[PDB]
Amino acid sequence: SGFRKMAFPSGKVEGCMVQVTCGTTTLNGLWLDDVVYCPRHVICTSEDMLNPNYEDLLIRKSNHNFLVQAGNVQLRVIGHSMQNCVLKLKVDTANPKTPKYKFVRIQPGQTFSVLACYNGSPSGVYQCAMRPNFTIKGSFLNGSCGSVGFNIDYDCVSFCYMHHMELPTGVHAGTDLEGNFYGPFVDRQTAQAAGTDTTITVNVLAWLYAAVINGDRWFLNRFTTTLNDFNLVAMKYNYEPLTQDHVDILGPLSAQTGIAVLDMCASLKELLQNGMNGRTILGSALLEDEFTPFDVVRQCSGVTF
Amino acid sequence: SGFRKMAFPSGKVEGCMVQVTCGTTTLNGLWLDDVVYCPRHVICTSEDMLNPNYEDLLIRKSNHNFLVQAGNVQLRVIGHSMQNCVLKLKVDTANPKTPKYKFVRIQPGQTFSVLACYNGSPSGVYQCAMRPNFTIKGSFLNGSCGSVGFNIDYDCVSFCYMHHMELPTGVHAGTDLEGNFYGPFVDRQTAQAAGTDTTITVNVLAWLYAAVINGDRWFLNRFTTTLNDFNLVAMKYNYEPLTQDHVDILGPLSAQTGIAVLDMCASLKELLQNGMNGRTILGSALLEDEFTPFDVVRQCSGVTF
Ligand SMILES: [Cl-]
Ligand SMILES: [Cl-]
Ligand SMILES: [Cl-]
Ligand SMILES: [Cl-]
Ligand SMILES: [Cl-]
Ligand SMILES: [Cl-]
Ligand SMILES: [Cl-]
Ligand SMILES: [Cl-]
């Protein structure tokens, strides 16, 4: 029993974290086989921050301008190349702690673990979701850039996120490990701002199923709804559309608990129209949207209480 | 910016987790140097569960009755001894991944990271607090027993918790790594139940300071209070007493933000008397009590926004 914001065990990633310095700028890198991946903004200076031309800034660098340190071991850079918004630093040594890994891009509403790092040294691990507006509500301070987000399946690390910047509302933007940004954000100082966000409806339903699995039914009701009628109420409360595929993804949780997905939608509609009236669900006074259906199945018993 | 339930990086602990089997019972062990620590209830059978005499059950065992597996390597048990509610299995091999470690017992209201494990294999990492009633609101399924809780200071793992059982309300009880239970709980099937719990007042204030550091002031007010008058309101809402030492521990956060501790107590009093009125703090609709003053300083900038 119980239900927590649970991250994947971080060890396989901790063994990949290194420090990257270019002049006076230090941030984190990811050392996999003989390549170190880091944010290309490591080559920006205070003057280059409003309108850097990275192609122009990088052609002016040499291998020896990059200092890479794995703990107290310097790694010699023997090549460099720009990969969209990531730099690939080829080093003379393959990382012997390289896990089985993949580079996967995630969808808005999917979750991942973040290993927050400073000067190549892991500080903490937490769970995050990719918001519908392609930001993440991370926890990151100056120097966290190059920290990565990941999921683990068996022994294989799926890297999905590299941290690049903080937006003015204090939420975070970054790239996949091929250096392609999530969302309309760029790695320079601009007027960029997170657009309007919405609530991840399929996740809120997953989390209501978690609550039922965990033996709490208070918010359930005798009503059902159509998908179209649910979406009409959803839209009104700034919730993402729920799709038939979302209904099918909630199938297994629906089968475990015996609560039809559209009956759980009727429950959610009532919670949106009435609020919780001083009650909690799984220890929250808000409708939680950063647990996926997979997260709930991963964490909860395969037997309902 | 941002504020998450942040665990310590788990790798140093993952390299210590092993599987322990005695007959048909399998749970997790902690392999440090040449000792494996696990819950003594691994020696209980279905018949021995209401009234086991563990001294009586253990004298009937031999070294060879214990099967210990570190991944796919069997560890040979060359000695065994009971340490309060933990078994110490001496093995023929020192764990080469043993980190620098200590066994520390924590106080009610202190936080720690949990590495939830099944069959010696880490599943996830989350943050927990020791509740005032000496339970933890964990996330644990059948077979999680022997999972450990820890804090990390520099390179040194302070183990503080080993998981032993789930109570009827779905909260969790266990021991320190010397096998001494937190709280009035025992490792057998009895009528035991978590007693009444309270809110960890010093933590709620810490978390209000976190909110201010993170640039949110909405809940602040022009009032102050005495410690005695605050405690009179606290008691009424099932909050722990706030002590002068708690005031002194909140000193550095008070100095960073320029908000006197008793002025933050006046803020908390108002939040207890009025509620939040549909507003949130750091993304919660409840007063969060599982962040310590240390957790806030560890996570938040040393510069207020
Ligand atoms: Cl949590
Ligand atoms: Cl060197
Ligand atoms: Cl923004
Ligand atoms: Cl909500
Ligand atoms: Cl969180
Ligand atoms: Cl073997
Ligand atoms: Cl209980
Ligand atoms: Cl509250």
**Contact map slice: A 201-240 vs B, CB within 8 A:** 214-215
Residue identified by tokens 């253990």 is: B58
Tell me the three-class secondary structure of A129-158, residue by residue.
ECCCCCCECCCCCCCCCCCEEEEEECCEEE
**Residues paired with residue B127 on neighbouring β-strands, in sequence order:** B113
Rounded-to-integer distance, Cα A276 and Cα A130, Å: 26
**Residue of A11, A171, A301 lying closest to B141 (CB–CB):** A301
Rounded-to-integer distance, Cα A237 and Cα B231, Å: 39
- Tell me if residue B42 falls in helix, strand or coil: helix
Interchain pair A10, B9: CB under 8 A? yes
Rounded-to-integer distance, Cα B160 and Cα B166, Å: 18
Q: Please report which ligand is nearest the Cα atom of A172.
A: 3
Do residues A52 and A37 touch, judged by C-beta distance below 8 A? Answer: no
B11 and chain A: CB distance < 8 Å anywhere?
A: yes
Rounded-to-integer distance, Cα A174 and Cα A149, Å: 10
Burial class (CB in 10 A: 0-12, 13-18, 19+), A274: exposed
Do residues A101 and A157 touch, judged by C-beta distance below 8 A? Answer: yes
The residues near B138 (Cβ < 8 Å, ≥ 6 apart) are: A2, A4, B114, B116, B126, B128, B144, B163, B171, B172
Do residues A262 and A227 touch, judged by C-beta distance below 8 A? Answer: yes
- Tell me if residue B77 falls in helix, strand or coil: strand
B125 and chain A: CB distance < 8 Å anywhere?
A: yes
Region at A303 (left for phi over 0; alpha for psi -120 to 50; beta for the rest): beta
| Of A22, A38, A41, A117, catalytic | A41
CATH code for the domain defined by B1-14+100-197: 2.40.10.10
Residue identified by tokens 């927590």 is: A4
Looking from the CA of A25 toward its CB, the CA atoms found within 13 Å total 18
Rounded-to-integer distance, Cα B244 and Cα B261, Å: 10
Interchain pair B214, A172: CB under 8 A? no
Buried b or exposed e, range A40-54, using 16+ CB within 10 angstroms: bbbbbeeebeeebeb
Q: How far is the CA of B158 from the centre of ligand 6 (A)?
A: 30
> How many CB atoms lie under 10 A from the CB of residue A94?
11
Residues of chain B positioned with their CB less than 8 A from the CB of A284: 284-286
Interchain pair B126, A4: CB under 8 A? yes
Residues of chain B positioned with their CB less than 8 A from the CB of A129: none
**Residues paired with residue A89 on neighbouring β-strands, in sequence order:** A36, A80
Rounded-to-integer distance, Cα B246 and Cα B265, Å: 12
Residues of chain B positioned with their CB less than 8 A from the CB of A140: 1-2
User: Which letter does DSSP use for residue B191 in this model?
Assistant: S
> How many CB atoms lie under 10 A from the CB of residue A305?
11
The residues near B260 (Cβ < 8 Å, ≥ 6 apart) are: B224, B254
Q: Please report which ligand is nearest the Cα atom of A91.
A: 2
Do residues A78 and A68 touch, judged by C-beta distance below 8 A? Answer: no
Buried b or exposed e, range A139-154, using 16+ CB within 10 angstroms: bbbebbbbbbbbbbee
Rounded-to-integer distance, Cα B60 and Cα B82, Å: 13
**Parallel, antiparallel, or unpaired for β A111-118 and A121-129?**
antiparallel
Buried b or exposed e, range B228-254, using 16+ CB within 10 angstroms: eebbebbeeeebbebeeebbebbeebb
Rounded-to-integer distance, Cα B97 and Cα B34, Å: 11
Task: Name the minimum distance, in Å, from the CA of B64 to any CA of chain A.
Answer: 31
B274 and chain A: CB distance < 8 Å anywhere?
A: no
The sign of the dihedral angle between the CA atoms of B296, B298, B299, B304 is positive
Tell me the three-class secondary structure of chain A, residue by residue.
CCCCCCECCCHHHHCCEEEEEECCEEEEEEEECCEEEEEHHHHCCHHHCCCCCHHHHHHCCCHHHEEEEECCEEECEEEEEEECCEEEEEECCCCCCCCEEEECCCCCCCEEEEEEEECCEEEEEEEEECCCCCCECCCCCCCCCCCEEEEEECCEEEEEEEEEEECCCCCEEEECCCCCECCCCCCCCCCCCCCCCCECHHHHHHHHHHHHHCCCCCCCCCCCCCHHHHHHHHHHCCECCCCHHHHHHCHHHHHHHCCCHHHHHHHHHHHHHHCCCCCCECCECCCCCCCCHHHHHHHCCCCCC
Do residues A136 and A130 touch, judged by C-beta distance below 8 A? Answer: yes
**Parallel, antiparallel, or unpaired for β B100-103 and B156-166?**
parallel
Domain ranges for chain B, please list them. Answer: 1-14+100-197, 15-99, 198-301
The single-letter code of the amino acid at A77 is: V
User: Which letter does DSSP use for residue B9 in this model?
Assistant: P
Q: How far is the CA of A78 from the centre of ligand 2 (A)?
A: 15
Q: Which CATH architecture has domain B15-99?
A: Beta Barrel (2.40)
> How many CB atoms lie under 10 A from the CB of residue A88?
15
A153 and chain B: CB distance < 8 Å anywhere?
A: no
Rounded-to-integer distance, Cα A102 and Cα B266, Å: 51
Tell me whether residue B22 is one of the annotated catalytic residues.
no
Residue identified by tokens 């209480």 is: A305
B139 token code pair? 């996330």
Task: Name the minimum distance, in Å, from the CA of B59 to any CA of chain A.
Answer: 33
The residues near A173 (Cβ < 8 Å, ≥ 6 apart) are: A134, A135, A136, A164, A165, A166, A167, A181, A182, A183, A185
Q: How far is the CA of A37 from the centre of ligand 2 (A)?
A: 19
Task: Name the minimum distance, in Å, from the CA of A282 to any CA of chain B.
Answer: 11
Experimental technique of record: X-ray
Length of chain B: 305
One CATH from 1.10.1840.10, 2.40.10.220, 3.40.50.261, 1.20.120.1200 for B198-301: 1.10.1840.10
Do residues B175 and B85 touch, judged by C-beta distance below 8 A? Answer: yes
| Of B22, B41, B128, B172, catalytic | B41
A11 and chain B: CB distance < 8 Å anywhere?
A: yes
**Residues paired with residue B101 on neighbouring β-strands, in sequence order:** B157
Rounded-to-integer distance, Cα B174 and Cα B131, Å: 12
Interchain pair A139, B6: CB under 8 A? yes
The single-letter code of the amino acid at A81 is: S
Rounded-to-integer distance, Cα B286 and Cα A112, Å: 25
> How many CB atoms lie under 10 A from the CB of residue A304?
15
Burial class (CB in 10 A: 0-12, 13-18, 19+), A229: middle
**Parallel, antiparallel, or unpaired for β A156-166 and A100-103?**
parallel
Tell me whether residue B16 is one of the annotated catalytic residues.
no
The sign of the dihedral angle between the CA atoms of B175, B141, A246, A163 is positive
Measured at the alpha carbon of residue B62, what is the angle toward residues B60 and B63, in degrees to the nearest 5? 150
Of A88, A117, A93, nearest in space to A103 by CA: A88
Q: How far is the CA of A267 from the centre of ligand 1 (A)?
A: 24
Intrachain domains A1-14+100-197 and A15-99 with the same fold: yes
Rounded-to-integer distance, Cα B185 and Cα B192, Å: 7
Rounded-to-integer distance, Cα B100 and Cα B98, Å: 7
Separate counts of helices (H) and strands (E) for chain B = 8, 13
Largest CA distance in chain B: 69
Do residues B95 and B31 touch, judged by C-beta distance below 8 A? Answer: yes
Rounded-to-integer distance, Cα A150 and Cα B9, Å: 14
Residue identified by tokens 């035991």 is: B192
Query: At A40, phi and psi to the nearest 5?
Result: -65, -20
- Tell me if residue B97 falls in helix, strand or coil: coil
Task: Name the minimum distance, in Å, from the CA of B11 to any CA of chain A.
Answer: 4
Residue identified by tokens 């820890």 is: B150
Do residues B159 and B152 touch, judged by C-beta distance below 8 A? Answer: no
